[PDB]
Design a protein around this motif. Structure first.
Motif, PDB file in Angstrom:
ATOM      1  N   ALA A   1       6.037  53.711  77.669  1.00  0.00           N
ATOM      2  CA  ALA A   1       6.004  52.501  76.818  1.00  0.00           C
ATOM      3  C   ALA A   1       4.715  51.729  77.044  1.00  0.00           C
ATOM      4  CB  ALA A   1       7.205  51.616  77.108  1.00  0.00           C
ATOM      5  N   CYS A   2       4.125  51.248  75.964  1.00  0.00           N
ATOM      6  CA  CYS A   2       2.878  50.513  76.042  1.00  0.00           C
ATOM      7  C   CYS A   2       3.143  49.014  76.031  1.00  0.00           C
ATOM      8  CB  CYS A   2       1.959  50.886  74.881  1.00  0.00           C
ATOM      9  SG  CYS A   2       1.382  52.619  74.901  1.00  0.00           S
ATOM     10  N   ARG A   3       2.082  48.227  76.097  1.00  0.00           N
ATOM     11  CA  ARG A   3       2.207  46.784  76.089  1.00  0.00           C
ATOM     12  C   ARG A   3       2.702  46.270  74.748  1.00  0.00           C
ATOM     13  NH1 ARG A   3       3.100  47.043  80.076  1.00  0.00           N
ATOM     14  NH2 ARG A   3       4.820  45.970  78.992  1.00  0.00           N
ATOM     15  N   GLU A   4       3.341  45.121  74.806  1.00  0.00           N
ATOM     16  CA  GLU A   4       3.890  44.472  73.642  1.00  0.00           C
ATOM     17  C   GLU A   4       3.022  43.285  73.262  1.00  0.00           C
ATOM     18  OE1 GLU A   4       6.157  44.414  77.008  1.00  0.00           O
ATOM     19  OE2 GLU A   4       4.087  43.708  76.995  1.00  0.00           O
ATOM     20  N   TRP A   5       3.336  42.644  72.145  1.00  0.00           N
ATOM     21  CA  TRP A   5       2.639  41.432  71.768  1.00  0.00           C
ATOM     22  C   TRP A   5       2.848  40.371  72.843  1.00  0.00           C
ATOM     23  CZ3 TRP A   5       4.469  36.827  68.617  1.00  0.00           C
ATOM     24  CH2 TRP A   5       3.390  35.971  68.360  1.00  0.00           C
ATOM     25  N   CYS A   9      -3.208  42.499  78.699  1.00  0.00           N
ATOM     26  CA  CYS A   9      -4.125  43.586  78.392  1.00  0.00           C
ATOM     27  C   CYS A   9      -5.362  43.487  79.270  1.00  0.00           C
ATOM     28  CB  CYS A   9      -4.532  43.559  76.913  1.00  0.00           C
ATOM     29  SG  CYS A   9      -5.561  42.129  76.437  1.00  0.00           S
ATOM     30  N   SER A  10      -5.975  44.623  79.546  1.00  0.00           N
ATOM     31  CA  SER A  10      -7.194  44.649  80.330  1.00  0.00           C
ATOM     32  C   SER A  10      -8.344  45.123  79.456  1.00  0.00           C
ATOM     33  CB  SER A  10      -7.024  45.562  81.546  1.00  0.00           C
ATOM     34  OG  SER A  10      -5.886  45.184  82.307  1.00  0.00           O
ATOM     35  N   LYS A  11      -7.979  45.808  78.380  1.00  0.00           N
ATOM     36  CA  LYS A  11      -8.935  46.366  77.449  1.00  0.00           C
ATOM     37  C   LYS A  11      -8.178  46.893  76.236  1.00  0.00           C
ATOM     38  CE  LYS A  11     -10.895  50.197  78.963  1.00  0.00           C
ATOM     39  NZ  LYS A  11     -11.600  50.986  80.005  1.00  0.00           N
ATOM     40  N   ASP A  12      -8.885  47.229  75.168  1.00  0.00           N
ATOM     41  CA  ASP A  12      -8.246  47.718  73.947  1.00  0.00           C
ATOM     42  C   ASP A  12      -7.390  48.940  74.251  1.00  0.00           C
ATOM     43  OD1 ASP A  12      -8.581  47.598  70.680  1.00  0.00           O
ATOM     44  OD2 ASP A  12      -8.294  49.650  71.403  1.00  0.00           O
ATOM     45  N   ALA A  13      -7.995  49.902  74.933  1.00  0.00           N
ATOM     46  CA  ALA A  13      -7.341  51.169  75.244  1.00  0.00           C
ATOM     47  C   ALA A  13      -6.207  50.999  76.255  1.00  0.00           C
ATOM     48  CB  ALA A  13      -8.363  52.167  75.761  1.00  0.00           C
ATOM     49  N   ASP A  14      -6.103  49.811  76.832  1.00  0.00           N
ATOM     50  CA  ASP A  14      -5.044  49.506  77.786  1.00  0.00           C
ATOM     51  C   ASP A  14      -3.934  48.763  77.067  1.00  0.00           C
ATOM     52  OD1 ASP A  14      -3.919  48.824  80.609  1.00  0.00           O
ATOM     53  OD2 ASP A  14      -4.348  46.842  79.776  1.00  0.00           O
ATOM     54  N   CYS A  15      -4.267  48.295  75.880  1.00  0.00           N
ATOM     55  CA  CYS A  15      -3.338  47.557  75.054  1.00  0.00           C
ATOM     56  C   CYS A  15      -2.521  48.526  74.199  1.00  0.00           C
ATOM     57  CB  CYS A  15      -4.122  46.564  74.201  1.00  0.00           C
ATOM     58  SG  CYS A  15      -3.093  45.441  73.200  1.00  0.00           S
ATOM     59  N   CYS A  16      -3.122  49.686  73.903  1.00  0.00           N
ATOM     60  CA  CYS A  16      -2.407  50.836  73.333  1.00  0.00           C
ATOM     61  C   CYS A  16      -2.075  50.653  71.856  1.00  0.00           C
ATOM     62  CB  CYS A  16      -1.113  51.082  74.107  1.00  0.00           C
ATOM     63  SG  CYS A  16      -0.224  52.607  73.655  1.00  0.00           S
TER      64      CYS A  16
END
Length: 35
Positions: A1-5, A9-16
Motif C-alpha cells: 500500500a502506498c501513501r494516501e492524501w 511524502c519524501s519525494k514524488d516517487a515516494d508518494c506513489c
C-alpha cells in the motif's frame, strides 16, 4: 500500500499514487493533480 492524501511524502516517487509531494513543509501528499 502506498501513501494516501495528506500522507507523509519524501519525494514524488515516494508518494506513489496520483498525488504530488508537497512543495511546502510539512511535505505531505496533496491532491493537486486535478487535471
Amino acid at each position: 500500500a502506498c501513501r494516501e492524501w495528506l500522507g507523509g511524502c519524501s519525494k514524488d516517487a515516494d508518494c506513489c499514487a496520483h498525488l504530488e509531494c508537497r512543495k511546502k513543509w510539512p511535505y505531505h501528499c496533496v491532491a493537486d493533480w486535478t487535471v
